[PDB]
């Protein structure tokens, strides 16, 4: 539609990021609770992020799922760009993990099944995310998972072999990322984390990881299934949702 700031009421800051601030906001008619991300044109143009942002919008815009954070629209003025985004009361999973250190089996498997559902939809539309990670994972009213940020240290922890190596890739990259995420949830740090780019890269290419003692036979099995070098020996998303460990522990 057509929009300007005049079309809705601004609350006060809901977090401050690299290019500007999300604020709470309400449409003047309808009275919808929504988030309003704002980005300063001059800093955007300065970092050369403008092209990337524009494509990400257009991609996100065509995805509608209770588990994928929705983008309602965008608009701009001389100095800034504005994203009408779904509000997410309970923040980022990254923040929730830095609080609790690690997550119980029940919480994790829930989070997984949400993520898997989201990605079943994406893959229905031939879209791949390639950057599923905790900083990208926002928590809903019911503590529901909303995946955000579609478009493209810890710049490589969730990446599979075939992408560090510039090789052909498919949807099985989200499955790798999912296994990485399962591990991080249960264990509190990623499985291939090393001190250096090169040592991390060494670890991923060899799928060299180990489990803390306390990790259960169930999670071990599923995580192990997901982190296989060969992408064609990773499971389908159906098989994850049907996994004994997942059924057992998901809300």
């Amino acid at each position: 539609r057509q929009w300007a700031l005049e079309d809705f009421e601004i609350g006060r800051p809901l977090g401050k990021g690299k290019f500007g601030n999300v604020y709470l906001a309400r449409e003047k008619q309808s009275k919808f609770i929504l988030a309003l991300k704002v980005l300063f044109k001059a800093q955007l143009e300065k970092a050369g992020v403008e092209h990337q942002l524009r494509r990400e919008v257009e991609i996100q815009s065509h995805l509608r799922h209770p588990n994928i954070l929705r983008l309602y629209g965008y608009f701009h003025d001389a100095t800034r760009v504005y994203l009408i985004l779904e509000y997410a009361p309970l923040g980022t999973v990254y923040r929730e993990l830095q609080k609790l250190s690690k997550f119980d089996e029940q919480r994790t498997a829930t989070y997984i099944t949400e993520l898997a559902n989201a990605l079943s939809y994406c893959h229905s539309k031939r879209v791949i995310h390639r950057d599923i990670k905790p900083e990208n994972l926002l928590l809903g009213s019911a503590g529901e998972l909303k995946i955000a940020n579609f478009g493209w240290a810890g710049t490589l922890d969730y990446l599979p072999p075939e992408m560090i190596e510039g090789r052909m890739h498919d949807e099985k990259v989200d499955l790798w990322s999912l296994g990485v995420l399962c591990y991080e949830f249960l264990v509190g740090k990623p499985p291939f984390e090393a001190a250096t780019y090169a040592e991390t890269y060494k670890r991923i290419s060899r799928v060299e990881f180990a489990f803390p003692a306390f990790v259960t036979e169930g999670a071990r099995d599923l995580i192990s299934r997901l982190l296989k070098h060969n992408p064609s020996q990773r499971p389908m998303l159906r098989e994850v949702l049907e996994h004994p460990w997942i059924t057992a522990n998901s809300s």
Partner: peptide
């Protein structure tokens, strides 16, 4: 909680941007 509207809101965002420079 407290939803400002109008030029109050305008001032809000503009001030925030000014600050963004630093």
């Amino acid at each position: 909680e407290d939803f400002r509207s109008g030029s109050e809101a305008f001032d809000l965002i503009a001030q925030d941007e000014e600050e963004f420079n630093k």
